[PDB]
């Protein structure tokens, strides 16, 4: 309820060190996957793909992208239980929209073939606007993926799962490591999940945010 959600938002923090001996149970792993798969997205575009690494070898592959100037994020990836790599589509076309329309049809979203056509016209409008008017389709799809990351950070907290969102990685190295670009995807945020180690210095520091008077305008 309100107590538990405000508590989950205040108690979560960006874990800097995970307990390498503790692993997430299948029940929490399955809840994490369902949560991100069910995420909302503009016109239900779901322009994403997720790599979920639980093996030591799989996490080592992801950690190749956190070397040199990004080495400070390496241990978070290697010591965590599960590492989720959020990927966004690099482009979107008519063929993707029709696949999406068909999956919605098979899920019983439309009463008539007319309501199906309506959803397609409405979606094609927002999509073509971003592709050709604002010319920011790739950034717009990345925004949907960040919204999803948001659901996972709060959701993980509510399940007593420690997490840390990571942008400090070489996306070119990570993309090449999983052939994402060739598949029409690019990595944008890495989120390791697990349990913080007691030595994690960031777990004892207070959370800092702008004051309410600064970020809100009530009318």
Which 166-205 positions form the footprint of ligand FMN (CB under 6 A)? 166-168, 189
Residues 33 to 92: which contact a second copy by CB under 8 A?
33-35, 37-40, 42, 44, 46, 48-55, 57-58, 61
> With binding defined as CB under 6 A, does residue 37 bind ligand FMN?
no
Backbone angles phi, psi at 8, to 5 degrees: -65, -40
Judged by beta carbon, residue 38 or residue 91, the one nearer ligand FMN is: 38
Q: Which does 132 bind (CB under 5 to 8 A by kind): ligand FMN, a second copy, none?
A: none
C-alpha dist (Å) from residue 69 to 123, 169, 188, 194, 212: 41, 9, 17, 24, 35
Q: Phi/psi class of residue 182: alpha, beta or left (left: φ > 0; alpha: ψ in -120 to 50)?
A: alpha
Q: Is 33 a catalytic residue?
A: no
CB of 105 to ligand FMN, least distance (A): 14
- Nearest CA to 83 out of 112, 105, 63 is that of 63
Q: Is 94 a catalytic residue?
A: no
Q: Is 16 a catalytic residue?
A: yes
Q: Which residues pair with residue 193 across a beta bridge?
A: 82, 163
Q: Which does 151 bind (CB under 5 to 8 A by kind): ligand FMN, a second copy, none?
A: a second copy
Compute how many other C-beta atoms are within 10 angstroms of the C-beta atom of residue 146: 13
Q: Which does 73 bind (CB under 5 to 8 A by kind): ligand FMN, a second copy, none?
A: ligand FMN
> With binding defined as CB under 8 A, does residue 124 bind a second copy?
no
> With binding defined as CB under 8 A, does residue 31 bind a second copy?
yes
Sort 34 into a burial class: Cβ within 10 Å, 0-12 / 13-18 / 19+.
exposed
CA distance 125 to 130: 9
Residues 137 to 156: which contact ligand FMN by CB under 6 A?
144, 147
Active site amino acids: 16, 76, 167
């Amino acid at each position: 309820n309100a107590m538990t959600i405000v508590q989950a938002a205040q108690s979560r923090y960006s874990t800097k060190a995970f307990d390498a001996s503790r692993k997430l149970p299948e029940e929490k792993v399955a809840a994490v996957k369902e949560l991100i798969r069910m995420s909302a997205s503009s016109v239900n575009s779901q322009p994403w793909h997720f790599i979920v690494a639980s093996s030591e070898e799989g996490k080592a592959r992801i950690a190749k992208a956190t070397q040199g100037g990004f080495a400070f994020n390496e241990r978070k990836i290697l010591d965590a239980s599960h590492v989720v790599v959020f990927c966004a589509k690099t482009a979107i076309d008519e063929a993707y929209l029709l696949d999406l329309l068909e999956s919605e049809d098979k899920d019983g979203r439309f009463a008539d073939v007319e309501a199906k056509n309506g959803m397609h016209a409405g979606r094609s409008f927002f999509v073509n606007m971003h592709r050709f008017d604002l010319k920011d389709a790739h950034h717009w799809m990345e925004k949907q993926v960040y919204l999803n990351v948001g659901t996972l950070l709060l959701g993980a907290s509510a399940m007593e799962i420690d997490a840390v969102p990571i942008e400090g990685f070489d996306a070119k190295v990570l993309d090449e490591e999983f052939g994402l670009r060739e598949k029409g995807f690019t990595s944008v945020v890495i989120v390791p999940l697990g349990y913080h180690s007691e030595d994690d210095f960031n777990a004892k520091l207070p959370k800092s945010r702008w004051s309410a008077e600064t970020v809100f305008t009530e009318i």
